[PDB]
Design a protein around this ligand. Sequence first.
Ligand SMILES: O=S(=O)(O)c1ccc(O)c(O)c1
Ligand SMILES: [Ca+2]
Ligand SMILES: [Cl-]
Ligand SMILES: [Cl-]
Ligand SMILES: [Cl-]
Ligand SMILES: [Fe+2]
Ligand SMILES: [Fe+2]
Ligand SMILES: [Fe+2]
Ligand SMILES: [Fe+2]
Lengths: 359, 359, 354, 355
Amino acid sequence: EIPKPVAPAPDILRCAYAELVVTDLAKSRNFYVDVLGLHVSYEDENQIYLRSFEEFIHHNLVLTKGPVAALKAMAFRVRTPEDVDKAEAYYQELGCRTERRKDGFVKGIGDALRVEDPLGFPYEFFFETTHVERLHMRYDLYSAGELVRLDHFNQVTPDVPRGRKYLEDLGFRVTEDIQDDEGTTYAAWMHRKGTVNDTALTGGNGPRLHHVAFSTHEKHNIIQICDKMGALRISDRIERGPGRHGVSNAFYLYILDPDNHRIEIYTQDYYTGDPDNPTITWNVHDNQRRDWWGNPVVPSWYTEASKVLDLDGNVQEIIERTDDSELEVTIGADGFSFTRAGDEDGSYHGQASKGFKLG
Amino acid sequence: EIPKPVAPAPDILRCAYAELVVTDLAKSRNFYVDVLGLHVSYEDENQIYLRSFEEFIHHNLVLTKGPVAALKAMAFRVRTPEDVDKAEAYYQELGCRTERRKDGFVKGIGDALRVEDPLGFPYEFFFETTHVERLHMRYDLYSAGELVRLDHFNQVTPDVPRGRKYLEDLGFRVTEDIQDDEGTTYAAWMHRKGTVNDTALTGGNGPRLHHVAFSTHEKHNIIQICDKMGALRISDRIERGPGRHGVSNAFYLYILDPDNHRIEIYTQDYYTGDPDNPTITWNVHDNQRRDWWGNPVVPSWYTEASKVLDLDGNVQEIIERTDDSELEVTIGADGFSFTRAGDEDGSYHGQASKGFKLG
Amino acid sequence: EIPKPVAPAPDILRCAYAELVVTDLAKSRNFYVDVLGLHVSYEDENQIYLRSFEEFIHHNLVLTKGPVAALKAMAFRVRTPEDVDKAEAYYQELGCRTERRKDGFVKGIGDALRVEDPLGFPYEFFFETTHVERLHMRYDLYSAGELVRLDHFNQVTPDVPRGRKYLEDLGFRVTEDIQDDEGTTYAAWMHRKGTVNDTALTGGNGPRLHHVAFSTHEKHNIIQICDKMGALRISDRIERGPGRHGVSNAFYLYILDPDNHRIEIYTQDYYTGDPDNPTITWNVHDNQRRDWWGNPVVPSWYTEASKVLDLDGNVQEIIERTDDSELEVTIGADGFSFTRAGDEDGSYHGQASK
Amino acid sequence: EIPKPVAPAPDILRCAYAELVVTDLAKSRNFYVDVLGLHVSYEDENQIYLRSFEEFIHHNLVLTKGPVAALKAMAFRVRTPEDVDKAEAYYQELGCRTERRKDGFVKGIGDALRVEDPLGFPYEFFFETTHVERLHMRYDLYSAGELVRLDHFNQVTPDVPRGRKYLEDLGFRVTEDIQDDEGTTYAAWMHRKGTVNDTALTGGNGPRLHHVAFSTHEKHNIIQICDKMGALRISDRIERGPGRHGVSNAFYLYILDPDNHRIEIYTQDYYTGDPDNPTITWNVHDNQRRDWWGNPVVPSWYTEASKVLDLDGNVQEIIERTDDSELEVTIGADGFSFTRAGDEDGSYHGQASKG
Ligand SMILES: O=S(=O)(O)c1ccc(O)c(O)c1
Ligand SMILES: [Ca+2]
Ligand SMILES: [Cl-]
Ligand SMILES: [Cl-]
Ligand SMILES: [Cl-]
Ligand SMILES: [Fe+2]
Ligand SMILES: [Fe+2]
Ligand SMILES: [Fe+2]
Ligand SMILES: [Fe+2]
């Protein structure tokens, strides 16, 4: 159990950026800039700094060339410079390794703290960042698939309640989760900025990074990304979707970058900023919980995720989940799901929905 | 081979309506009216007559109570009253059974000819029909999922080239097809009204009716149908999609009515009215041909289809396809598909795309 | 200037609901329910309580039958029950008239404070509210024009800087404003919940309520409201739009209810939650500031607005703006606007655009 | 009245392309290619050949550098090569001037007939055309404002009934029109391809070209064109809209190219292909007939339109309309319009709607 510090939690505003290590900078650039249309704030032979259409901070995504593709940092912006000091004291009380750089780890960020958190994830906290031209009315640049914001991260961790408790102490509030009747938790979503999530926990072997999510304005923008990937003959990099989520109610798509980092495209979740925002718990066997239309969840969604680094740049050792597997209990040979609770019509046993089993 | 008659073909305008036999009229009404929003032109204890938002003829769909669910007629409107006489002479020359009713088979249709066509399908040709209020600007009635037109039919038949030649002689032009490199045709689409299709042939045991298709204005309307089916907890009646087609380039969805009659919702195909419109042939192993995003085609899409009736109302006997099966050659045991021609990366051997196999 | 209380400001979450007095309850019901598709949370012969598709608090709009159409209260939800006590102490220190009802003024709200604020507006602060079924996935009920959230209020007041400073003291942060080179402020927008606004000030004679805004998911939903109004042959109740705003970047529409209360439909403004969110100032003569496409702003949009009531239910007296008029300086006889600053081509003099 | 030929009318498929004379080819290129995103089929120092996203024929728009901006030809494609013969005989019987070129007037068109028609318009009829890559699934190229098809032309002509009869004999069917209670016709729309129009007649001084219209897939595509024009700070080239039409029920926008040639962007009209398609007639004083939302029609929309050329490349003389003016009777000093027929409330006297 991760203790609650006496030291006050930093006031976290929102997810702000991720630094992903990539193996081939030019191929990664082709994906994030030419395919997805993100906007370059800075680049050189070592790194590409990218932002979304409506962002004013320096970036939402740093692509860093390195030997092993991995998450290097998931960064949250805090409310004041003083909250970076609060972050440092807080994680020091937790007994985590921390590293503080007054002039930042990446360009366009100032005073920053990186930590190996209690779940093995490299978190960054910062306030100071270089402002850039906010492109929100640059309709001369707007693409048919425009990514307009960074919305959230999603983390794979073996023990969801243990991680949830720690994130609650840090000020994140649970919006939705997935459980079964025998009391196992499979996933939880939690926020600071008044949307369904800023980070989320997916049960699985970890620490691994499940995905980073960007939003679009409208559903047709997500459709266009799919259409464009078809035209580029890279439909094999469309992992899952598009669909409507149960959890979050957002329209969604999952795609894979050249190093298999998973990117979610997302729109039209709901407001969660009231403190008594009603929590929603889904049964793991409800076949509308992940895709509201009942479409099957592709097995790689449950099995594959990115390595994460420690503060030395080495890959974090993975710890196996011992709680039940969502894949197994829903779409594996022993699994089951339902459309209507208690109704055998529209229920699936030992296979996925829509007539498929696991390949 | 079906000979070309000496008698002139009737001048066919478009697909106009289908008559489906249903087993429980109230259950079927709930699907087509309460779920899908079609507009009631007339109903009684035996039939429901339904039209789309932009239609001015009496109906696009007749639901007729009967003991065995089946297609009873697919009806095409012809250009003049005299074209019904032409139809009669044409099909008589083909040696087909025909039935002529000066005052119609169904309400709101006048002088009509029904025929057991050379592929065993019940076709109707008519000109005369009762005009009704055209609801195309009745935005006070417009549904978030509104079906705006009848678009096409799709027929399952064992020998696609045989049927294709007959429909070409009747004046339908093939817009797209699916073939392999060994002389097999798996499917063809053909039109009169200047869209991708008015009827289509899908290879398989037949005669059976694969689907009837209605159009929407925009892609979000199709999304809404899915969303509504989730809210009604009938997502199990979403068979396949939503997607982007390769063939037709339309955005699409397939759903199943209470008797398992398949309905396609469709939007934003392209203009085909020029007489040298380029015919697009897809290779059967191209994994973007049916779903442009490479999502797998659900096996029921290839195996399941509705019975069709003869003019006496008895079910037509099924003739087995002996040509190769699209299912088997793409997703079955010895199947193959590709993302990029000649690339092993993104190819699938003996399974479907996206991590699935046949149940 | 309105002094800052020593008493701590209540922690305001967001705009939550408006109580509008209407003269014919059935006619108003037809507009808000049958035309606009809002969801009934309670109704009787005197009041209709309505909410948007994604709401979980009891209501976003209360229609109350009364003799004179007016705004009766514009209500903000606060973070905790103790914030209602804070609001009471705060407005008492401002010297404002206050009324506290521990069981609420309207159904589905608990302990609530109403105040005649320093600008003459009836504000309510509350925490307690009856939760209802959140309809956000009830796509069986979803309209082609569905209104999904309450987004903001917009207030007409004569001195925008005076009101702005007062709202900033209450914790609202300015996101955008309209000024000229002479130093006049014509309008400001300000927020708590991390969108472009929860309330906004339009320079003019006040206190009057300019509009209440609801959001949709997508731009086609706004189109559909216009299309429906054409089908119902009430297109004369479309006042302005649909358009793209300059300020806020939102897609918008303004329509008029049966008592001439103005309702905005709005979608797709941007995130403002960071405390150093860059503030945008437009020049009043920029013809893309209000409608990005340069469509003219109809004079009624500048001149017409709803009465507001005091705590006794009487109409608040109005104070005339003495600062320059946006209408006069842009589309009046001596006004002007530009498409490109410094270019006579695409400029309009003594005249609106187009 | 224009007589009906004994000679059979050509089978016309659809509107196919327009040739527009422009004064500065580079400025026009910037508008049609960089702003609007049309696809270049061919270009040189004198001409740009452009097509829409879903087209397979060579082009939908030819921009031809010349000294006077004008319509040079509005072209319709016919069903067979023999229909170009039929067209030639038909217009010859009408007593119209004709010119036929076996190798075309512009690149990518083969055997083609141009005529000075009975209303003074330069029509082309052709079958043969060079097929190009259909870009309908090139979503790697797709713009947020993508123009997907050529939809129609709209012609300004002084006597609408006279022109209507002639187009009906030529095989166009009237889908919608605007009349009043005193026997005046102000406008008519007419088709071959099964949409609301392929060409249309707008009452006014003519011959002039009112506009050329291109389709989008969705309404948001039209909104994006407006948004982009705002970002480019050329919102003054937005003339009217966006809106919903009464006539046609399409979502629409009107913009102005660098020589003031008017382009409509259009989507989601309805199917008209049945021969008994119900004709819809609006009253000229109905304020929802042109913009369904009641937004006012700016006077320039009524007064301004492009010159057209004869077969020698000279500007056609303009004949004045003597029938009542739609502008005057609706928004002029003595004009009138209504929201609800018979209701004084929401009516407008001697001014336009919405203030
Ligand atoms: O017309 S404005 O662009 O000034 C504008 C922007 C945001 C609003 O909410 C508003 O009502 C007005
Ligand atoms: Ca082969
Ligand atoms: Cl999910
Ligand atoms: Cl398909
Ligand atoms: Cl119009
Ligand atoms: Fe996610
Ligand atoms: Fe189909
Ligand atoms: Fe507003
Ligand atoms: Fe037009």
